[PDB]
Amino acid sequence: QYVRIKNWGSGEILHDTLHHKATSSCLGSIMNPKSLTRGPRDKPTPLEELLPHAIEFINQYYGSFKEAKIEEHLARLEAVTKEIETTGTYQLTLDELIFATKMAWRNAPRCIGRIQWSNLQVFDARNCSTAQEMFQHICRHILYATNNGNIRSAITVFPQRSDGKHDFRLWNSQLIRYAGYQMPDGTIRGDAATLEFTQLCIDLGWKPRYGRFDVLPLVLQADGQDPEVFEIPPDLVLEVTMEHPKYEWFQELGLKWYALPAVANMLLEVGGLEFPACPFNGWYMGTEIGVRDFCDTQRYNILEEVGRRMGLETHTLASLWKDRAVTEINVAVLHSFQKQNVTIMDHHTASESFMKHMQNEYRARGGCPADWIWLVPPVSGSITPVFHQEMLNYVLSPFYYYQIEPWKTHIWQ
Amino acid sequence: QYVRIKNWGSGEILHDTLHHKATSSCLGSIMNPKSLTRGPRDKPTPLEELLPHAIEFINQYYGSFKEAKIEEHLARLEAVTKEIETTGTYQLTLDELIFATKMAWRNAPRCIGRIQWSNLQVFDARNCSTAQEMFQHICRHILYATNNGNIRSAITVFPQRSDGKHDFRLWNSQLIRYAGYQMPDGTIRGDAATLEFTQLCIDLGWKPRYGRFDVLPLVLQADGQDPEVFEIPPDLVLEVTMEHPKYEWFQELGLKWYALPAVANMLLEVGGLEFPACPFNGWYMGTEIGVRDFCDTQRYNILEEVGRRMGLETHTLASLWKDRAVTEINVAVLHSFQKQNVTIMDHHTASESFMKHMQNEYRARGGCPADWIWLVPPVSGSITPVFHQEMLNYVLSPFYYYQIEPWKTHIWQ
Ligand code: HEM
Ligand code: HEM
Ligand SMILES: C[C@H](O)[C@H](O)[C@H]1CNc2nc(N)[nH]c(=O)c2N1
Ligand SMILES: C[C@H](O)[C@H](O)[C@H]1CNc2nc(N)[nH]c(=O)c2N1
Ligand SMILES: CC(=N)NCC[C@@H](F)C[C@H](N)C(=O)O
Ligand SMILES: CC(=N)NCC[C@@H](F)C[C@H](N)C(=O)O
């Protein structure tokens, strides 16, 4: 039948039937395809499928060693095979997990920062058991990663999925995100993208401050239990106030953004095992904040105000006012982060670094999964070198997958 | 153990243990005692208890006739007995139901308007089956009762309780009531008494207008199904704008109140049967609006503003400013209703009418159940004659009982 297509700017959906007349459709520009998602479960991974995946991963791990260790490799293969037969699953050694988190990052097609793949701090929280313990592990992660502005890449691995009925899940999209409230006067306040989740927190008892930059609480689910809400300690959230190196009126906008880009809802998959809760972070690329968070019409939508304040021909598109504005906003973002000593990289230096990483990957392992659509910056496309680089997008393992929103697949009891 | 005691002005609860030292406690001033409540059920009324109640009621009904009808009485006794045996319950004839609604009103200890007991319009909605049908019946009731300001007493009887798992219930306390929102700025807006129910409606998808006089939607439950929300047609809600016959600044307060006092959450009990949904209405007594709705510290709390506007010594209680203010507010209420041709009676004329009704009841059936605590007006106590009248409070049958709030005893599926 029809293929559902969505416009993220207007939220409109369209149904494609015409593709049926195709000579041989391409789902390339789809944000969340099923091929990139790992849904929930009701019973453990069938032993028949888990086993071969595990063997493959142990072989990958032992193959990494410059100086091979055949005995340990064979021994581990034996132990893993036996463990899966005596328990149903298996536990990774801390070293294997570290390797897995890095390979998964290394295998993320949609990430430009992959040249940093080998530099990741891993926090092993596989022994965690309560929401409260998750919250502490997260506060620890936030604190280590922020590092007073000198951002460090890290990841916290919670307990792996067992029977799918007892998994750990962070209901947040990112560790730190701002609230979005649809004011009584019809207007939207704060981050429009977190409108629904904001209502969820409010439903769960959270206290709405109705500001434009209120950090939402951590909503944590442990051992398949109902989620518990935790306010993030303000002392842990490092923010940057926005100001332009020129244009002293920029600061009058009262804009700021958090310094920690930490993905919180992805699933790690390695050797057949799946970790439903494994928050990670790197540092920001200027355009994420300057172009998308501030300028997306569905986010902060500050373009017109900035253009108007710059005295541009705001009512005539051909004036390229939008181009001029967005660039000044990116300048503000980079300027502020740098002035306040918070790590950030511009979308040129990063593109160039990704290009170096790519050539490195090709000679190291003959390939690099890349999703051109996500890798090319939201501005200056053809100015960056990644735009002119042909790439192949494919899914390997270990890998970070999306997941269905937990509030959609969950029961009170 | 301890007896729980509550202060409705502060919401504070106290635990009474000292009563254990009593020589022989009185639960007289308790608002909702268990003796006045009829809770939910899980199975039909045991046949052993239902039968004798039914016979008692049929005897009461046939005893009412000035000219006795022995044959029909015996015949009806026989038919009812048989029907309960062949079905489990029984159906009242329309005439018996009318009689039941009036006797129950006649048996309401907490009502001063009982001199009007024989004048009640009964709408038979026992054949109703959906929320939508309930809503139409209610709109019909509201329209008939309002009568363009010439208020008429009426009651709509929905299907009786069967097994307790399929009953009709209006989740509203009154047909027409105003919303109460706890504003983002910490203040409460509108009717503080409907704060929780307002949140319920908002949870059920209702659209909050954040005003101080927004009519809440009808929340109807039919055949034990989940409740459905219905906005009351504005054309049906007759309101009165408040203004003082002198003091032209009174209207500047922007106060008003609905003209229809319609109790929506009480249960009718007759001959063993219980009707969980049977909204009824009479007309207003000035003090309900002027003293309690406007002046209760937990409702509109307009006393200080009115006192201040009257130029009274607002900061010195001994000045009796509160006394002076509340009386001017009652004057406003009566004045407005009368000017706008909407039925209402002052708390003097009504007290005197209740007293006439009481002497009537004593000679007619040797008694009148009266709850002195509710019958004496909230102002001018000893000035009204009911204050000096000793009365006995007792529960008869038919009777209107309270019920546990439905959101407390209900399941999605
Ligand atoms: C250290 C510097 C890093 C930079 C500058 C960087 C930058 C980026 C950028 C620009 C995106 C696009 C996000 C968006 O458009 O919403 C992204 C996505 C992503 N990055 Fe990186 N990243 C870094 C570190 C990491 C680390 C440490 C991991 C994993 C351990 C990682 C995993 C991913 C993944 C899986 C995505 C998924 C995008 C999605 O589908 O939502 N990144 N990164
Ligand atoms: C027609 C004029 C009527 C007047 C002026 C009148 C007046 C009153 C007043 C002043 C109260 C006190 C309410 C409060 O303080 O919250 C009351 C309560 C009550 N009235 Fe009447 N009423 C009238 C008609 C009716 C009718 C038609 C019925 C029944 C068919 C009725 C049943 C009751 C009951 C059961 C209460 C219960 C109070 C409670 O516990 O909430 N009233 N009435
Ligand atoms: C393609 C899809 O319509 C969506 O707009 C994509 C485009 N490329 C992107 N690239 C990145 N890095 N992040 C994004 O959110 C998107 N959005
Ligand atoms: C007695 C209990 O504390 C409560 O205040 C009672 C007092 N008498 C009343 N009388 C009427 N008519 N209505 C009421 O709400 C009350 N409230
Ligand atoms: C690690 C990084 N630079 N971004 C990853 C994706 C997410 F965490 C950031 C998001 N793009 C944001 O702008 O808030
Ligand atoms: C029927 C009557 N006069 N009052 C009954 C009780 C209730 F309907 C009215 C409430 N006292 C109010 O002021 O809104």
> Which secondary-structure segment (H or E) carries A257?
strand A256-258
Residue A187 C-alpha from the chain's centroid = 28
Asked if residue B374 belongs to a known ligand binding site, the reply is: yes
The question of whether B288 is a catalytic residue gets the answer: yes
* List A114, A161, A177, A299, catalytic entry: A114
Q: Which of these CATH numbers, 1.10.510.10, 2.30.42.10, 3.90.440.10, 3.30.450.40, describes A127-152+167-238+402-406?
A: 3.90.440.10
Mutate to test the pocket of ligand 2, among B111, B112, B268 (most ligand atoms within 8 A of CB): B111
Nearest CA of chain B to the CA of A362: how many Å? 55
Phi, psi (deg, nearest 5) at residue B341: 55, 40
What CATH architecture is B239-261+284-349?
A: Alpha-Beta Complex (3.90)
The Cα B236–Cα B342 span in angstroms is: 14
The Cα A386–Cα A413 span in angstroms is: 49
Which residues in chain A have Cβ-Cβ distances shorter than 8 Å to B190? none
Distance A114 CA to ligand 3 centre (A): 18
> Which secondary-structure segment (H or E) carries A362?
helix A349-365
The Cα A101–Cα A107 span in angstroms is: 10
**Residue of the CA atom closest to atom 29 of ligand 1:** A105
Asked if A221 contacts A227 with a C-beta cutoff of 8 angstroms, the reply is yes
In CATH terms, the superfamily for domain A9-126+153-163+267-281+351-375 is Nitric Oxide Synthase; Chain A, domain 1 (3.90.340.10)
Asked if B177 contacts B299 with a C-beta cutoff of 8 angstroms, the reply is no
- For residue B17, the tally of other CB atoms under 10 A from its CB is 9
User: What string of H, E and C letters represents the secondary structure of B295-355?
Assistant: HCCCCCCCHHHHHHHCCCCCCCHHHCHHHHHHHHHHHHHHHHHHHCCCCEECCCHHHHHHH
Give the largest CA-CA distance in chain A: 72
The question of whether B139 is a catalytic residue gets the answer: no
Burial of A48 (0-12, 13-18, 19+ CB in 10 A): exposed
The Cα B198–Cα B120 span in angstroms is: 31
Interface of A with B (CB under 8 A): 184, 203, 208-210
Asked if B403 contacts B276 with a C-beta cutoff of 8 angstroms, the reply is yes
Q: Atom of ligand 4 at shortest distance to CA of B373?
A: 8
The Cα B96–Cα B136 span in angstroms is: 24
For residue B202, what are its two tokens?
């908002």
Phi, psi (deg, nearest 5) at residue B4: -80, 130
Nearest CA of chain A to the CA of B307: how many Å? 32
Asked if A114 contacts A360 with a C-beta cutoff of 8 angstroms, the reply is no
**Which DSSP string corresponds to A84-144?**
HHHTSS----HHHHHHHHHHHHHT-TT-TTGGGTT--EEEE-TT--SHHHHHHHHHHHHHH
- Give the orientation angle of helix B94-106 with respect to helix B47-64, to 10 degrees: 90
Closest-CA residue to B101 (of B65, B54, B53, B153): B153
Report the half-sphere exposure of B151 (CA within 13 A, side-chain side). 25
AA identity, residue B161? R
Mutate to test the pocket of ligand 6, among B284, B285, B402 (most ligand atoms within 8 A of CB): B284
> Which secondary-structure segment (H or E) carries A3?
strand A3-6
Of A184, A209, A210, Cβ closest to residue B208: A184
Phi, psi (deg, nearest 5) at residue A178: -100, 150
Nearest CA of chain B to the CA of A216: how many Å? 16
For residue A200, what are its two tokens?
């969820």
- Residue B109 in contact with ligand 2 by CB distance below 6 A: no
The Cα A268–Cα B352 span in angstroms is: 79
The ranges assigned to domains in chain A are 9-126+153-163+267-281+351-375, 127-152+167-238+402-406, 239-261+284-349
The three-state secondary structure class of A252 is helix
The Cα B222–Cα A295 span in angstroms is: 49
> Ligand 5 pocket by C-beta < 6 Å: which residues?
A 174, 261-263, 281-282, 284-285, 288-289, 292-293
> Which secondary-structure segment (H or E) carries A280?
strand A280-281
For residue A308, what are its two tokens?
């108007």
**Which experiment gave this structure?**
X-ray
Asked if residue B387 belongs to a known ligand binding site, the reply is: yes
**Does a cis peptide bond (omega within 30 degrees of 0) precede residue A208?**
no
Name beta bridge partners: A6.
A13
Mutate to test the pocket of ligand 3, among A8, A31, A298, A375 (most ligand atoms within 8 A of CB): A31
> Which secondary-structure segment (H or E) carries A321?
helix A321-339
Contacts of B52-59 with CB under 8 Å at 24 or more apart are: B52/B272, B53/B271, B53/B272, B53/B397, B54/B80, B54/B81, B54/B84, B54/B90, B54/B271, B54/B272, B54/B273, B55/B80, B55/B81, B56/B271, B56/B397, B57/B96, B57/B100, B57/B270, B57/B271, B57/B272, B57/B397, B57/B398, B58/B96, B58/B271
Q: Do domains A127-152+167-238+402-406 and A239-261+284-349 have the same CATH topology?
A: no
Name beta bridge partners: B268.
B275, B400
- Residue B117 in contact with ligand 2 by CB distance below 6 A: no
* Resolution of this deposited model, Å: 2.3
The Cα B77–Cα B74 span in angstroms is: 5
The Cα B55–Cα B53 span in angstroms is: 6
User: What string of H, E and C letters represents the secondary structure of chain B?
Assistant: CCEEEECCCCCCEEEECHHHHCCCCCCCCCCCCHHHECCCCCCCCCHHHHHHHHHHHHHHHHHHCCCCCHHHHHHHHHHHHHHHHHHCCCCCCHHHHHHHHHHHHHCCCCCCCHHHCCCCEEEECCCCCCHHHHHHHHHHHHHHHHHHHCCCCEEEECCCCCCCCCCCEECCCECCCECEEECCCCCEEECHHHHHHHHHHHHCCCCCCCCCCCECCEEEECCCCCCEEECCCCCCCCEEECCCCCCCCHHHHCCEEECCCEECCCEEEECCEEECCCCEECCEEHHHHHHHHHHCCCCCCCHHHHHHHCCCCCCCHHHCHHHHHHHHHHHHHHHHHHHCCCCEECCCHHHHHHHHHHHHHHHHHCCCCCCHHHHCCCCCHHHCHHHHCCCCCCCCCCEEEECCCCCCCCCCC
AA identity, residue B266? M
Name beta bridge partners: B16.
B3
Q: Atom of ligand 2 at shortest distance to CA of B101?
A: 30
Which residues in chain A have Cβ-Cβ distances shorter than 8 Å to B210? 184
The Cα A123–Cα A231 span in angstroms is: 21
